[PDB]
Amino acid sequence: LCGKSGRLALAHKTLVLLLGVDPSRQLDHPLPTVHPQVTYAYMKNMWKSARKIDAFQHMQHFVQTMQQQAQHAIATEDQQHKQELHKLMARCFLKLGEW
């Protein structure tokens, strides 16, 4: 909602506060692959705000890390955890294509 209203600086501050790490100073290292939702939000925000290129590579990497999870961790019981993964990674694939 803050991003929609345009006061994007507050949104960026809130994201770095919740995430705990600020890649805007550490440009090279990848995003913290844990907590896919907050990183997805930060990625959408950084696409929108200024940078329109390195976002693509971050998406590539984040996808190849997310689909890496259940295929390399074939849980025999956790079936209610991978469905949200499927839906989220479908979202990110579509964003990838249209970008």
Q: Is 91 assigned a ligand-binding role in the annotation? A: yes
44 is annotated as contributing to ligand binding = yes
| Separation between Cα atoms, residue 65 and residue 62, nearest integer Å | 5
Instruction: Decide if 59 contacts 92 (C-beta within 8 A).
Output: yes
User: Is 7 labelled as part of a ligand binding site?
Assistant: no
- The answer to whether residues 3 and 45 touch, using CB atoms and an 8 Å cutoff, is yes
Residues in the chain: 99
Residues flagged as binding site for 1D-myo-inositol hexakisphosphate: 4, 44, 91
